[PDB]
Symmetry: C3
Subunit: 313 residues, 3 copies
């Protein structure tokens, strides 16, 4: 036996239900046009919710029995960010469940919103005390607490009818994104990331697409100048990351590639709005199909790894 | 006697009339709803104006008789920024006086606008020559010449009826803010500030709230998507700074805490617009009351220090 | 004879047809108000096109016979950016030619759009692998592939009737600008540029003005809040650069000053829209006259250098 061993569920694995849940919601937003999309959405949503329940129970066990492992990830100026996946996914599962039970959905949405805001207020701000975060801590994962969590609150609160509160969270996320990205890309240019962190390059896809998806959730799918602007930068980053992909996976394909699923799923979700708004419909179809294929491949890779006993640690 | 001694009025003390003047204007913008607000506004405005006159005379004496002390602050890549408080407050006193004498108000507004634009044009640009500003010069005080001064011109010019000119200054300030903040927050994460500078952390509260207050001044109080976005990031920063407050005041409460008053007063001012627009009225009431209490505490602390002979150097 | 010698046309000389072509387009947009502007526009456009043809042929010769010289500029994390001038100018010549032959214009616009997007996708993204770009590589020239090229595609695609595609390129450029500038200005504050690179300070004038010109091209000249905001920051930078000009030219006037022509020409172009929108007409006239005088001086300086055998290497 081992004196200690890393917990079998890495915190980052919450990216799996994140990607699936967000994709569920994208398909939900096609039911208006193609009713069969609802079936696809419901299946994705149930799968995402089941995985989320499992991973929540797993993390509760980690908290109870391996608390010092949680404490170390929490105080790390790099690893803390993955904890934000927990409230993010809680909110997304709420959004799914709203179709069946708005009361339970609302409870999950508030828990995740309060949770994420408390988390950032405690930890993101603490970094400003200096001396712990280093230049080498400037990782794409920082987008999770700083940006993605706020966008998720924005769209979830809008779903509940709190549009103006949603706009506050939206603004927090959008300005936080624009304020962080400059220093991230400069860091990547000079130093980049070591292979072990490179899959997290996929999170760089997320901001513009998660931003526009949240924006369109609040504004009832009105595809305006801001929405088009966001899509343009989002596609620029997609092209860049496609070119970089062989480098990203230099040391092999791995489960970390779920990092891409936040941007991919939000590409799909926002595409449904562009399509329905009759804006760039051809691009929209491409984006929706591309992102589904990509996430499909992540799912097949993940099943392969599970099949081989190479998923949990 | 002393060969030399620091001048008794630190340049930063212009933050006192700044906070009071801006708060006067917030109360002025409640007269529409509650006429008694005018009395509160007039008292704040008179007090702010009297303090400003005193401090202007004091600084004129510093210029005449201690010019090398001014020169050293001016050429410092850190301390130069506080000089921008002079034209900022000149403009704010003009805005107050407009209620009684638009001619004198207009003169003050132009003096402060020309003054601040000349100041930045001379000094902010000079930094781009390199070799003087250092990484450790990356302080929140830079927001004063770069951001706050432009927003103040924007709203003061709008008051005079020059809305389109006001939008030019508004854009200068808003884009300058977004262009500086990324590097400021990265610096704070890595190095932070020494206790002696930490109260200036309060200036980090200012940008979003000063921005939205200026925006709403130009646009006749129309609370739109941009306004809501700005408030959201503003409240994020408020939460962060509240969490950081014990650290900010690690070495004790001090007069430097007037740094917070620009953001606090602009929180109050913008709240009056949100309230009147029937947007987030409960948040608005909270924000207005909170910021008044906070500034009230600054005033009581300041009276205490004066009472004890611990205000002037 | 020499074993090797730098090619006689520096890649940066494509800034000459850029400035002239963009200025042609500014005058074109005055024909509505003053028909004689068309003659001025046509002359500028023909001159720009002729120079562009020459320089394209020259660069094709460089590619064929001095390929390793191109390869070295391409792989440089600093010098690669000037290559973007080639597709940028290709697009601008297309915009000119559209007045006479929309078919040929469309071909040039697509070639330049595909070319610039391929170029950035290959090279700008590659920088994110780290270890090649250094802090000292943080130069204004980076705006050429990252920002200017996207804005040029935006307005050229709008000219062809592809407004929504144009908005995608517009957003890519605008967000890329805001994401790069923070780190550029911090670098200039700390380290600046050596005299040999200082003329490229002129490119700092470009972003806001090129941005607003592209925006107004897409949106049919509607001078709205965004347009005014952009002009305000653009003029701030103009003032800063005017103050810095003696420093910029410390070691003498040189052909590198064509770096300013992208911002100058776009100042002129956007002024035509402000004027026609009856927004800040006096500022507009000033801006249009100023930028024409400036570019006129660049032309006279260039003729002088050609006259003296000091243009080509
Ligand atoms: C998702 C939940 C993450 C929470 C991690 C909490 C980190 C706790 O932090 C610790 O709390 C201890 C008390 O229990 C204190 O003794 C320590 O000072 C502090 O490190
Ligand atoms: C997803 C929601 C997680 C919130 C739980 C965090 C509670 C931990 O406790 C808090 O953590 C601090 C964080 O910097 C520690 O310094 C202190 O113990 C305390 O402030
Ligand atoms: C960081 C990039 C932010 C860009 C924000 C774009 C400014 C908003 O764009 C606005 O869109 C409106 C609706 O489409 C139009 O009516 C306005 O004319 C336009 O200015
Ligand atoms: C977000 C993108 C998902 C929507 C995919 C819709 C694909 C349907 O395809 C479209 O069907 C239309 C009739 O309904 C036809 O007029 C179009 O030619 C066809 O492209
Ligand atoms: C609010 C006003 C601040 C102005 C500070 C001015 C700094 C002056 O600067 C100095 O000017 C001198 C001449 O008087 C020159 O001898 C010096 O070179 C220069 O340092
Ligand atoms: C609030 C308005 C203050 C403007 C006064 C500044 C005048 C000082 O004089 C100017 O100052 C320069 C600034 O870099 C010095 O280098 C030079 O003396 C001169 O340019
Ligand atoms: C840095 C963050 C900048 C965000 C700017 C928000 C873009 C403007 O937002 C615009 O607001 C208008 C009025 O409410 C709406 O009519 C438009 O639909 C919306 O795009
Ligand atoms: C910017 C916030 C300052 C405005 C404070 C207004 C507080 C008044 O209070 C409000 O009065 C209303 C009637 O006038 C009632 O309908 C509301 O229930 C009550 O909250
Ligand atoms: C405007 C056009 C610029 C293109 C520059 C291309 C840089 C080419 O790059 C080179 O390509 C070679 C093959 O020809 C390879 O041998 C090299 O690995 C690679 O350096
Ligand atoms: C203006 C349009 C120029 C596009 C031509 C570039 C083609 C060069 O070839 C490409 O260049 C790479 C760039 O990083 C090299 O690494 C590889 O050869 C290849 O990817
Ligand atoms: C980086 C700076 C981005 C600023 C974008 C400004 C947000 C858009 O500004 C919008 O302009 C519209 C048309 O004029 C107005 O109708 C809206 O009220 C206003 O919010
Ligand atoms: C982009 C700026 C270029 C336009 C320059 C136009 C200058 C014309 O000048 C204007 O002519 C008007 C009548 O046409 C008069 O009413 C105005 O007084 C005069 O300033």
């Amino acid at each position: 036996m081992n004196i200690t061993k890393p917990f079998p569920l890495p915190t980052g694995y919450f990216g799996i239900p994140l990607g699936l849940a967000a994709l569920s919601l994208a398909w939900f937003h096609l039911e208006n046009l193609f009713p069969a999309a609802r079936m696809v959405s419901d299946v994705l949503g149930i799968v995402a919710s089941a995985v989320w329940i499992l991973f929540i129970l797993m993390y509760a066990y980690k908290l109870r029995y391996y608390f010092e492992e949680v404490r170390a990830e929490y105080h790390s100026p790099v690893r803390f960010s993955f904890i934000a996946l927990i409230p993010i996914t809680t909110m997304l599962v709420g959004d799914i469940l709203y179709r069946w039970n708005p009361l339970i959905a609302e409870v999950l949405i508030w828990i995740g919103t309060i949770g994420q805001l408390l988390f950032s207020t405690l930890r993101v701000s603490e970094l400003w005390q200096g001396g712990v975060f280093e230049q080498k801590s400037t990782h794409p994962s920082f987008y999770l607490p700083a940006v993605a969590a706020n966008f998720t609150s924005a769209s979830s609160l809008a779903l509940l009818g709190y549009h103006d509160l949603g706009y506050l969270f939206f603004g927090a996320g959008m300005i936080a994104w624009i304020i962080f990205e400059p220093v991230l890309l400069q860091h990547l240019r000079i130093s980049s990331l070591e292979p072990q962190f490179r899959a997290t390059m996929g999170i760089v896809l997320a901001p513009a697409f998660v931003c526009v998806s949240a924006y369109l959730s609040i504004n009832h799918g009105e595809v305006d100048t801001l929405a088009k602007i966001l899509w343009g930068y989002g596609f620029l980053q997609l092209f860049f990351l496609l070119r970089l992909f062989p480098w990203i996976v230099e040391k092999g394909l791995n489960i970390g590639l779920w990092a891409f699923s936040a941007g991919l799923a939000s590409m799909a979700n926002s595409a449904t709005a562009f399509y329905h708004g009759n804006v760039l419909q051809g691009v929209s179809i491409f984006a929706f199909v591309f992102s589904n294929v990509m996430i499909g491949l992540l799912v097949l890779m993940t099943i392969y790894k599970l099949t081989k006993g190479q998923f949990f640690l």
